[PDB]
Amino acid sequence: AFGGWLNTQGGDFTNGVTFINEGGSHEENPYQGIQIGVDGAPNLVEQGEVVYDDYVFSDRMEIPDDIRKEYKLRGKTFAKAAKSAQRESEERPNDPLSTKGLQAAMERIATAQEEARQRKEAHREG
Amino acid sequence: AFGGWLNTQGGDFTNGVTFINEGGSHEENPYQGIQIGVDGAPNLVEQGEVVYDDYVFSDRMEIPDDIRKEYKLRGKTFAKAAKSAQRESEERPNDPLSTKGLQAAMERIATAQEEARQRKEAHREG
Amino acid sequence: DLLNGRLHMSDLELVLIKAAYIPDRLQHYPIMNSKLNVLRGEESKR
Amino acid sequence: AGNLRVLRLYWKSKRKILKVKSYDPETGEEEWNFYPENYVVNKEAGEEVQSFWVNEAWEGTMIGNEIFVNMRPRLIQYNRLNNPSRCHFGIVGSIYNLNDSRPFSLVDMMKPYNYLYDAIHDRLNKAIAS
Amino acid sequence: VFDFKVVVTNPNAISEIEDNKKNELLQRLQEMITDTSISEDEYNIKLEKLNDYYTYEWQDIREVRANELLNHYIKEYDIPLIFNNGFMDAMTCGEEIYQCDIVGGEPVIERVNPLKIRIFKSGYSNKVEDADMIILEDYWSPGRVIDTYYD
Amino acid sequence: DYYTYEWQDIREVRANELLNHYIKEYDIPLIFNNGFMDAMTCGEEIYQCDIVGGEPVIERVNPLKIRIFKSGYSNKVEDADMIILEDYWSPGRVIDTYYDVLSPKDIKYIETMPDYAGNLRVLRLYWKSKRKILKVKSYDPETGE
């Protein structure tokens, strides 16, 4: 089903990145989103968002250019920036360097997204 | 990464000398310097300084000529004098004589730097 | 080469050939190989 | 026969990787790691980097003349803990040779005497017949 | 004799890097028996199962997994007969070649026809792992192509 | 229980654990069997021990591909002042051995070779130089020794 998986040679090998690539937006689903776990119990995710290691990269918000040149992100949104840092390890899921390179890249985009969210949390409350 | 290391034959061999050769000055870094340990806890070092055996050779200060002819130092600063006493043992890290010759040379430049620092401590307080 | 079954005709005579046929070349029979393979087979088991 | 020609290529490519030297946060101990080329090196922490070219095992399969499948880095990289370029394919074996030569096999050293057995038994069979 | 067992080369040499990896495994089995057991009914059944694994080492847990993988697949595939056919290739052409691949998610081991393998850039090397490029050409069943590349 | 041990016991264990693992890893008895076959053929049994990939590794040397200079009348091959080793290596073996020292133009030299066997001539010189050293006599501070 192509999303963060390498389904070759009779197996199901992944790099850990969870492409939630079906359903639709939280407004479009009768169940209000794809549920990825009873943990909050409604862990609801939509068709654009990307999940790595229980961290969800949101497709709604976008990359500020100060957070684009710094941290060297590539995509327009944060989900589309997470889909470009996994493009190497997607077809070589079992290399140790790619698991090193993904673990480092997924942390950069994570701290980039938390940095953009604390900006917008301060932006509207001000 | 070339700094006091011989990365040959698939290994990482060093003479013990720690070239802190990235980042920048304490004024240039947001973290105020490269941290080399929680010991004082902020052990902060800059791009010029050289570390051997928990002793930091400062690049800021220079060699007085009385401390140059005596102790037979070569470089302009104390970091650049520590980079010249390690130039033999840098490419032969496993010779016993080079570990003897470095252990003796690093002590001469250390007592030279403490001698110059006690001069300047007396110089301004006078 | 003698252990690999190759006979150089220049090593056992002064040559007055280069074509692989017995009317002017010589068959080699490997009778020295079995002798050596005992001693390496004993060394395997020591 | 109704079978398909299956060609499989196994080949080592050259992958650019980065060797990053970082300092341990707790102790002043320099550390070494190997990263892919897309790694953003963390200066402001002293991470100085060098980039190397390194073997990487690849694989590809052609079926007939028109099918092209499994063209990707070989997913069993027979990896070693300290050498990033040391890998191979699944194909394991040996030549039973002597001193970098071509193998003088057991059949090869008995084939002269089998060919001579066939010539003398030919003379035997024509002597039996007449 | 065919006793091809994965052994620890130095079974009395345990390090702290092996002790930390053992502690991660033991705590991971703590969490899953915490979830899977329903409220002390079967928690002390799992607990008696887990306590005798404290006697083990990291190199013991790895040497058991390696043997269980090798014990089952030697008996499943009858691998001693695979090795007997390649030894017959060894006494004929001087070449004994085996391919290990994943087919259908299983590890599988095959012997290679020496007439249907091309070895390039090996050097003067004796071993076939030391080649930079290998081409394998054979005529396959249509069922074997669909059993191998269906996905 | 390491108080029961001695310094020579700790060293004799480390030496054996290094030798126990690598005899079984490399199957070193088969390496020695091939060189004994060289011994009964040309009278020469040569082995090279190097570091490749950070590992100690042991190889047997083809006697036709090793030049021994300034050995003297010495029987042993350790007693030579200069040895030249010339063999044709795989391009993967050159990148497995020198990846950390090959420059990008050196890697461009390897890929842009014509490749008409496709192996690289690898010449390795081993030689003894002359190093100037100093012998310093000092007195012990505590005793007059």
Next chain:
Amino acid sequence: NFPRQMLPFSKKTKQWRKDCLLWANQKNYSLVRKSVIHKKINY
């Protein structure tokens, strides 16, 4: 001719990989192996 292996992963595209297989169909000489004509006579 065999395409360039000294490339980034971005430029190892689907036509780059198809070029390596097309070269393999173009296709044997080794230094420590006999011919396939030699081995087949032995078999």
Next chain:
Amino acid sequence: TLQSSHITEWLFTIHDDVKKRALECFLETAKVALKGRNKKFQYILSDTSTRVMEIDGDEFAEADYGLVVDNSNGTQELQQKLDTLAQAALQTQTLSFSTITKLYTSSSLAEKQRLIEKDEKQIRERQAQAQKEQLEAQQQIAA
């Protein structure tokens, strides 16, 4: 006929080397199939064997972790040294009839070593508590 077996022994020693390396090559292929959503490995492995993949560093050779496929004279005597040690512990009541069957169905010389060490250590603690239990019963009668 033993000296005629020596002439062909050289052919068997390279054969045992290929079998050693093809089984190390099969083991590493099998380590990679584990992380590919195959439920067959949940039947041929343990629970602890299923969790070795959870730790980081399962991409490398087992010989980089101290494990080697080995069919040598040292391994064959180590198996029978552990087998005769078990029967010597079976009688004299140091090893149970339950775990002697586990040594018979073990396939690992580290597994069957740990079972010999287990049953010894269980029984000696049971003998240690039985010694004090009879001693405290003797003293509480006297008290």
Next chain:
Amino acid sequence: TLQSSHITEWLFTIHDDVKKRALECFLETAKVALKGRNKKFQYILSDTSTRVMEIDGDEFAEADYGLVVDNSNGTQELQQKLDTLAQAALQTQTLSFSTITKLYTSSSLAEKQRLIEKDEKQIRERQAQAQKEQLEAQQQIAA
């Protein structure tokens, strides 16, 4: 056939000399790879074996420290003299079933010597405290 083995024995004695020296040469190469940031040695060595490199003087031959690679008749009898001594200590309850397995998996004649000396010295101190414990129990009843 023993006198025909003598004709070729001279060829084997120089072979065992090369194997002795190439293994000493391999051991010194291995001592130098230790100080090169290789984590494989953290799996094949102990913790005490990892710390021999911390002391100064690991650049020299082991024969300058008293260690020699040795495959001679004295070493082979010293191994079996220690093996039969262990089984003689196994019965009569001087050596544990735990540590007899450690002698079976030891590879060092100094290691397995220290284990025989350990279990003897532990047990004789346990017998020494058990002798006084029964004697003081006898006297405190009489007191």
